[PDB]
Symmetry: D2
Subunit: 412 residues, 4 copies
């Protein structure tokens, strides 16, 4: 029972950071593929992917580990961009070239998704405009700038506010639950129109001149919000509104990017080209933190190290993800078929799935009982569960996990 002792001692020295309700503690020793092992030898099937960090497995993909060990002994990661280096150049080229839009783009590297978002804030404000529009339910980070854009759980913004002024939050086109009580699955256009109208006919009329809005920040699919997928043409309509006033569109792909939805960039599913994109988590292959902010060249700006290790890893990650897309979409069909009817709302694309329950207590029990069966799941939104297995998962491993989930749901 090494775990209990480690947990107790750790709780003494570490700052408090738990969910509500809090999940069962896990003292991990190591990982392999889609499996995690605690210090007591217990095995766990991972359906969390570390929320993106481990899209390619644990501790990472074999080819990525190989790259890391080699590069680390040459030039590591100073989280700085001063030192020109081949790895940095190669990853930059891939990120600008494979991202949506065939216009010239540039990339700014950072150490995390929140830093990538902080950089995006600077980019959109470089225009001279002062206001930013974001969405209720959205999550973009915890640093002061990023948390000003975040609006997931009120408690997360407690005590230390107020936050950055000039940020306005509006309803997201959540097809299952929204302020208009519209069924976004049956009437997608109606929901999209109400959301666009709220911005254009109210926010832009009563509160802020649209010409002073620097940009609109959004997740192509809300992660922390509960894996909420908006109507297919929502971003096309949002862009129409934005273009009308010269407002920039910032696509936060920190959690949905790099293969999660079966596309290199989740926004591709919505056939929309954003002005700025943020990446992180999976970009580092599960080995290390690295963030990236891709943006139209015409928006460019005006430490002492070289981030070679992180970039070398990211470069390999991009190649593996691209090679895996067909597999991701194939395995995704299994989740689509097997998850049907397992929740009050079952929504997903690629390997990005969400299960929402009208009963929060039921949601908590499903996660709790699943953990007791050796299946790792994470909550999302108010009463949903995110089902996000590593992109490298096999059909066989997927069914092992789904069988456990189905059995748990049947008894809870």
């Amino acid at each position: 029972m090494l775990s209990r002792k480690i947990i107790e001692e750790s709780d003494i020295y570490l700052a408090t950071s738990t969910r509500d309700p809090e999940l069962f503690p896990l003292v991990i020793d190591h990982g392999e593929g889609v499996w995690i092992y605690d210090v007591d030898g217990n095995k766990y099937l991972d359906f969390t992917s570390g929320i993106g960090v481990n899209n390619l497995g644990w501790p990472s993909h074999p080819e990525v580990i190989k790259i890391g060990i080699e590069q680390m002994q040459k030039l590591a990661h100073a989280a700085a961009n001063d030192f020109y280096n081949i790895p940095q150049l190669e990853l930059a080229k891939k990120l600008v070239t494979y991202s949506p839009g065939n216009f010239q783009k540039k990339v700014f590297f950072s150490n995390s998704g929140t830093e990538a978002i902080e950089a995006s804030i600077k980019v959109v404000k470089n225009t001279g405009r002062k206001y930013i529009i974001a969405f209720l339910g959205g999550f973009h980070g915890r640093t002061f700038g990023s948390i000003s854009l975040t609006a997931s759980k009120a408690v997360q913004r407690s005590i230390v506010g107020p936050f950055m002024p000039g940020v306005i939050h509006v309803p997201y086109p959540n097809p299952y639950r929204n302020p208009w009580h519209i069924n976004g699955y049956e009437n997608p256009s109606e929901l999209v129109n109400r959301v666009i109208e709220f911005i254009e006919d109210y926010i832009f009329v009563n509160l802020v001149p649209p010409e002073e809005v620097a940009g609109i920040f959004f997740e192509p699919i809300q992660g922390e919000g509960g894996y909420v997928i908006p109507p297919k043409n929502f971003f096309a309509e949002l862009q129409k509104l934005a273009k009308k006033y010269g407002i920039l569109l910032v696509d936060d792909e920190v959690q949905m990017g790099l293969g999660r939805t079966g596309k290199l960039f989740a926004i591709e599913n919505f056939n929309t080209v954003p002005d700025v994109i943020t990446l992180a988590k999976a970009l580092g292959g599960g080995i290390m933190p690295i963030g990236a902010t891709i943006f139209r060249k015409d928006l460019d700006f005006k430490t002492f190290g070289g981030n070679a290790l992180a970039c070398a890893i990211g470069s390999k990650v991009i190649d593996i993800v691209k090679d895996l897309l067909p597999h991701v979409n194939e395995i995704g069909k299994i989740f689509a078929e097997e998850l049907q009817g397992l929740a009050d709302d079952v929504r997903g694309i690629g390997l990005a799935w969400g299960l929402e329950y009208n009963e929060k207590k039921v949601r908590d029990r499903i996660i709790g009982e699943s953990f007791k069966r050796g299946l790792l799941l994470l909550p999302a939104g108010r009463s949903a569960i995110r089902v996000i297995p590593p992109l490298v998962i096999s059909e066989e491993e997927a069914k092992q996990g789904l069988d456990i989930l189905k059995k748990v749901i049947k008894v809870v």
Copy 2:
């Protein structure tokens, strides 16, 4: 001439980020010890230490690389603290135990120095107080919260402001150049008194109730500001003022900590125990980014991964630094002796040295000509140079660098 081509192509894809004046470009291939090698085979002696990131050499210390390669294959770095793990527990124990003060402390891990500072802002505001005092010339990071505390170069805060309200900046006790034109070396007490008076008799009288000031942020020695060392009893006096009103003291050791000044924590040189401390850069051994925010337990608060790789590395870093302190102070005497009279102001402690020139152009030339001789140096403040060789540097390597610097200064 592989370098030129890499530089050109990289400038096309990467966001603009250069100094003023901009330093000579460097396309690094790999490093070993205190030496750096570019893609064209050119060798460089490093007197920058990556501003802390590479305190233990390039790409890092052999023992740290060993730890990294091993741990990376077990459980890497998710930049999250959810996953309990032995490495995390061990580093946490070292950071709370070896930091100043024998009272109970806790530690919150992050991915960088700016994130560590963002966390410290939340910690001091958890009290309910709204104002923060920082120092002119100080540098604490670039994210929205941290940059609100930063006041190094005005251009760095251009375009995208205003910033976080409630932050007040006051003069730092810079012994060489200050608003009072006091020679802080001859009259340290006078300078300290003027600085304390400015806060207590003006800021606290005219602008903000001291009882509403959450904390005072400071660097024990200003880094970006030009390696400005304040009078020895400055922090003792600052703490007296703070205790009087229940104001917290936040010691930013991101650049001066972990051995740079011959002490594990630079504040030790000032015999003062802070309430909160931030660490980063060197903590990750030059292999990866990791930040830490240490604070009194009574200030504690109320993702899904395990930062084992970064913590395992940090744990080893702490042991190596502690073992190296005697060496650092010994080599420091060489710099103290050899740097005398080489600038209009020569100031330093341990291996933290600053050379300030009344003539900025002269400062720029010294750095430029040194680069042409194969010696890497970084500017600081308005017209100073920071001389910060890796802590693992030998007497022989130190003299090679000092000989070059002396020769350059003599001809410029």
Copy 3:
């Protein structure tokens, strides 16, 4: 043609301040009762009441003028509250005693409605809470604090923002036009529920902890917004939500108070007792500016003159208004009967009437042609007209104005 010359010369020396579209210029010489006379001898029937300032006629009521001339020669108006004086005491007593709620209250005097609102902001924040909720379409003043709460026309908040942080705007229960496209006249409960739900299930869930919301600011009937009257039980429901979290209710009666709606305080029509109330405009009888902020005694706080002239006038105003209420409601029935079917939406209570047209151009023409007939009207909202004759208007004078309005509407 003295007018044209005065207008031209005045436009040279005065700062630009015009509506869009701009109304016809008026160079007033004097007034009497409900009639205004320009410098060229042209007579105008006033249906604007100076938006409250002249509720009792022009230049004011005879009894008020008498009081003013007498008091002015004793102790005038220093816009200060330092000097104790009988007039101040008497008005204070009337304001605390006749305002809703039988609990102990206090009053803070100021010089305008925007200053009264600025004072209310301080009052609600004295609690220690940092957030404020206000309504889209609302208007509370133009000074920095008040304009942060205002959200009438975006252009009014242009250029000089961002504004006070921590202010969140939500939809008002406008029965004619709202984000839900609900007909608030046919389904009032549905609209009220959607508005309350937006705050409780979205704002309080995603954005801000309700326990940190200092207060909710609202107009009992939106003035600048277009004389928008919410469902009768809206404030009762709003108060239920507020009480649940200890949030204060601030009732801005600067435009709707003092008899306009047939009640001393417009909120009386909604059977709700607020925590704070702001008054201005009519309070000064049309003779001078004076604002008042009435609030529960338990919220009290912790220059060198005496506002006797303004208070003496206000005291008389209160008595005249109370005596006139029966008359106001009687004349109101005439407007109710005669205005029916004259606009796409006809809404009103007492002598507070609004006429909204789906066609903005039609709205502008009605106001313009009316001015050419000698009837003064003001626009409101996006395409509405406010019809607010002085409370002292006779049935005969009312019909003269209504006949003109009807004829204009019939030809436009």
Copy 4:
């Protein structure tokens, strides 16, 4: 003893608003010339002028009262500028014509000094610049925008902050007490240089780009700060700095303007032409509140009433003040001669005098004992007394007051 009863009852209904220490209560019935009479028949010689409001006597000047009674019966004061009217045109002409600078200017009317300052904030920000510099010890109003610029007593900014971001406060050139401990009377140039240096070499270097500073706000002589008169060439040097970066100079004359210092505009004593000027208090003749914001025409911008009563009064006030300047400067010599040696620092110009005592308790006693002798005085700064008799005071009345003050100072 009618007073005591009025005070008790008034304290029950009125919001708390007292000084620290609090002055003796005064229940004023009426006034005449420079004399005030309470409800119990007690007579008081006024050396406060209501801090400007009553520069022309109590309740006001006979000629002003005449104008007021007449105009009030024609068109009063709606605190609005919509209604063109002769009085408004005439006052506007006088304010633009007689203010410093022969370039084209415009004027925006408001209801108070704080509103005039709020308007000035909008004017300087209309440029697009976001930062504002103000001075420690300064006072510009209590509304949210104005209080953000104010920095007199910290307690005044307690509880309800933080305030408007982008406002930076720097030391004022106070010749008696400043952060540099410079004797500004013996070494004025030294003090001016230190103040200019603080802004140019520190604020503009470390904190904010000067090109982003909209304006510098200042009082030509700090009022609440203690009637602090800066060196004669301070504003000339301040303007040189401002012109260098296109920064605007805002001169707040709300307390020092309109004859107080022997000049129509106090800045005239410093031979400097500002870009924006604010006026209030005395402008209304002691009869009513009216504010004015005068500014260069090239800075112009892009309710329903006519402020005729207030403007008619202001127009007369301007003529009387201009006629009285010779008298003010003459009587001023008496105060200069008679006040010498009566305090630790005696400073003044025209009829604007300040007496500072190193002993605060002594300062409080002088004011208290003076009140007991029937002489009204107000405190200022930390331990000073402002001596500001009405501009209409006779030599005989001045000596009566000075004799009392001298006797009190001799026994305290």
